[PDB]
C-alpha cells in the first residue's frame, strides 16, 4: 500500500507469528474439509500405558482444491512488507512498505517440491536459518516455474530440459553459499517416512506419493524428452498436522489429473566431517511451516 521513506526494519522469517497463525488455519481447514474414514493419534501421557485415540467417521470423497488466502492485519497490529526483490528473509530491510493484506497465498500441502507459489523476481534465492547446520532445511525459490503433470494412473511428468536448467541454477546458488570450488551433488532422500521420502501432495482429493530419485541424481561443476516419475496413491497416510495416521477411501474417479507449477524446493545438505570438496543435497520437507515460510518470508506483523 504505502512505502515508508528512510525506514529500516529487521525481519526474521524463521521467527514469524504469521507462519504459526497460517499453520493453525490450514490444520483447521483440513479437519473441516477432508475427513478420514479412520483417524489414529497416540496418547502416552500415562505411566507405561499407551492409549491410541481412534476416531471412525463418515468419509465422503471430496475434490480438494486450494483457494488463495489473504492475511490482513490482526486487531491492534500492522503488516510490514520488505520490498527488496532479493531479500534473504533474515536481517535489515531498507525498503519497507505497510500493506493492508498479504498477497493471495494458496495453502498447498506438499513435501520436497513447493507448488503453485510465488517466484523470485530476479535470480534464484536460497534461504536457511543456519546454512552451516546440516540439519536445517534449505528453502529454494525459483525464478522460473517448472510444470509437473500428475495422473491417478500412477505417474508425474516433468520436462527434462527445463528441470536440468533448474538444477544448474540451484547448484550455482549453492556454490555461491558453500564454496566456489565445491562440486554440487543431488541425491535421493536418505530415508524416513514415505511422505518425506517421496514428493507427496494431494490431487483431486487423493494422496500421491511420487518417487523423486530421477529429479535428484546429478553432479554439478565437477536422456529422454520427459522425466516420468512413478507414483502411488495411498489410502493409509501419516498425518502432517500432528503425530498420527489416517485412512481414506479408495478413489472413485478413473480420471485424476492435475498440473502444478514447481516454484520452489525444500532441501537438506548432507554435511558431516568431510575434507571432500563436494556438497550433497537431498529433497526434504515435512514441516508445513516451511511451506508457509516460503510465501510469508517478506512480511511481518508489528503492534501499532
Amino acid at each position: 500500500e504505502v512505502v515508508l521513506v528512510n525506514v529500516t526494519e529487521n525481519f526474521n522469517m524463521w521467527k514469524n507469528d504469521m507462519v504459526e497463525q497460517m499453520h493453525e488455519d490450514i490444520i483447521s481447514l483440513w479437519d473441516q474439509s477432508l475427513k478420514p474414514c479412520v483417524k489414529l493419534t497416540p496418547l502416552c501421557v500415562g505411566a507405561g500405558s499407551c492409549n491410541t485415540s481412534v476416531i471412525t467417521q463418515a468419509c465422503p470423497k471430496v475434490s480438494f482444491e486450494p483457494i488463495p488466502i489473504h492475511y490482513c492485519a490482526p486487531a491492534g497490529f500492522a503488516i510490514l512488507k520488505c520490498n527488496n526483490k532479493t531479500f534473504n528473509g533474515t536481517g535489515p530491510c531498507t525498503n519497507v512498505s505497510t500493506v493492508q493484506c498479504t498477497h493471495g497465498i494458496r495453502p498447498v500441502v506438499s513435501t520436497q517440491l513447493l507448488l503453485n507459489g510465488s517466484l523470485a523476481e530476479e535470480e534464484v534465492v536460497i534461504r536457511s536459518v543456519n546454512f552451516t547446520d546440516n540439519a536445517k532445511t534449505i528453502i529454494v525459490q525459483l525464478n522460473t516455474s517448472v510444470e509437473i503433470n500428475c495422473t491417478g494412473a500412477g505417474h508425474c511428468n516433468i520436462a527434462r530440459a527445463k528441470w536440468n536448467n533448474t538444477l544448474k541454477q540451484i547448484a550455482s546458488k549453492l556454490r555461491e553459499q558453500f564454496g566456489n570450488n565445491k562440486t554440487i551433488i543431488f541425491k535421493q532422500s536418505s530415508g524416513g517416512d514415505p511422505e518425506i521420502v517421496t514428493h507427496s501432495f494431494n490431487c483431486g482429493g487423493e494422496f500421491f506419493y511420487c518417487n523423486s530419485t530421477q529429479l535428484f541424481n546429478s553432479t554439478w561443476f565437477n536422456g529422454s524428452d520427459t522425466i516420468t516419475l512413478p507414483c502411488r496413491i495411498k489410502q493409509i497416510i501419516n498425518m502432517w498436522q500432528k503425530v498420527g495416521k489416517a485412512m481414506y477411501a479408495p478413489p472413485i474417479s478413473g480420471q485424476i489429473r492435475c498440473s502444478s507449477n514447481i516454484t520452489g524446493l525444500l532441501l537438506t545438505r548432507d554435511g558431516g566431517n568431510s575434507n571432500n570438496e563436494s556438497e550433497i543435497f537431498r529433497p526434504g520437507g515435512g514441516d508445513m511451516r516451511d511451506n508457509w515460510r516460503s510465501e510469508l518470508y517478506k512480511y511481518k506483523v508489528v503492534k501499532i
Epitope: L40, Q57, Q235, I236, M247
Partner: antibody, heavy 128, light 110 residues
Framework: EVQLVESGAEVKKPGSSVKVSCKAS????????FTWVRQAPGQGLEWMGR????????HYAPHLQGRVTITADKSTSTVYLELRNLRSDDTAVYFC?????????????????????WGQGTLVTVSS | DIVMTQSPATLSVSPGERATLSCRAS??????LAWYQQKPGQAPRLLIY???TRATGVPARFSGSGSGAEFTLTISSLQSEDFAVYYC???????????FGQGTRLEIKR
C-alpha cells in the same frame, strides 16, 4: 491366499464369557482384514464385527456393541473373538472370515467388506 | 439399519435348468453387494462381490447383476453341486454395519 483354522467347540453357562481363536496361515497377515460371522442353528448368517488388522482397529454390529471384542496377534497371525455376558441365544456356530485388502504395508487399502476366506467354524453352546 | 430381504424363501428347480434368486435392500447399497453359497455343515463360500464380479474358482454359470437396492443371482444351468442355501450381503455403510439377507434355499424339484 490364507487358510483359517479355528479353535475347538465351547460349552458355556449363560453369563460366562468365551474367547475363540482363528489362526491365519499362508499369506501376509497384515494385508488382510478379518471378520466374525455367526449362525444360530436353523438360522442365517449374522455379521458381528471386523478388524482392520494393520491398524488394530475393530468395528462391531450395534446389537453387540459393548460386549464383543475382536483382536489380532500379529506375532502369531491369530485373530480373536471375545463375547461377554453370554446368553442362551448366543448359541451358534462362529465363523472367522477374511479378505485381502491390498499392499497394506505400503498404505494401499481397499477396505473390502466381502469375505473370501472362511474358517471351519466353532460351535459355541450356551446353556444351563 | 440396512435390511436385506431375499426371495423366494425356497426355490425348487429341476436339474439342468435356470435359477434366479432375488436380493432387495431397504435403501441403496450401490454395488457393495456379495453372494454366498452354503451347504449343510460347511462354511459359506463367496460367489460374487461388487454385485457382478465372480470370485476365483467360481464357474461362469454363476452371474450377478443389479445395483442400488435390487440384485439378482442367476445360475444358468443347475448342477448337482449347486443345490444349497444362498445369502446376499450388503457392505456399503461406514461406519460398517454390514448385514445379510435371510437366505434362499435352492432345492431339487422332482
Amino acid at each position: 491366499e490364507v487358510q483359517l483354522v479355528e479353535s475347538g467347540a465351547e460349552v458355556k453357562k449363560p453369563g460366562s464369557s468365551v474367547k475363540v481363536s482363528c489362526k491365519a496361515s499362508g499369506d501376509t497377515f497384515i494385508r488382510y482384514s478379518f471378520t466374525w460371522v455367526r449362525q444360530a442353528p436353523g438360522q442365517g448368517l449374522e455379521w458381528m464385527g471386523r478388524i482392520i488388522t494393520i491398524l488394530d482397529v475393530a468395528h462391531y454390529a450395534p446389537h453387540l456393541q459393548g460386549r464383543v471384542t475382536i483382536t489380532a496377534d500379529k506375532s502369531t497371525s491369530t485373530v480373536y473373538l471375545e463375547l461377554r455376558n453370554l446368553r442362551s441365544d448366543d448359541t451358534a456356530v462362529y465363523f472367522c472370515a477374511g479378505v485381502y485388502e491390498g499392499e497394506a504395508d505400503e498404505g494401499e487399502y481397499d477396505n473390502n467388506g466381502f469375505l473370501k476366506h472362511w474358517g471351519q467354524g466353532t460351535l459355541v453352546t450356551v446353556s444351563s | 439399519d440396512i435390511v436385506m430381504t431375499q426371495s423366494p424363501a425356497t426355490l425348487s428347480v429341476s436339474p439342468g435348468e435356470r435359477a434366479t434368486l432375488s436380493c432387495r435392500a431397504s435403501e441403496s447399497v450401490s454395488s457393495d453387494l456379495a453372494w454366498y453359497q452354503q451347504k449343510p455343515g460347511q462354511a459359506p463360500r463367496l460367489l460374487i462381490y461388487g454385485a457382478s464380479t465372480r470370485a476365483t474358482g467360481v464357474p461362469a454359470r454363476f452371474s450377478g447383476s443389479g445395483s442400488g437396492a435390487e440384485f439378482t443371482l442367476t445360475i444358468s444351468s443347475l448342477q448337482s453341486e449347486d443345490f444349497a442355501v444362498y445369502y446376499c450381503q450388503q457392505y456399503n455403510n461406514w461406519p460398517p454395519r454390514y448385514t445379510f439377507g435371510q437366505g434362499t434355499r435352492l432345492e431339487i424339484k422332482r
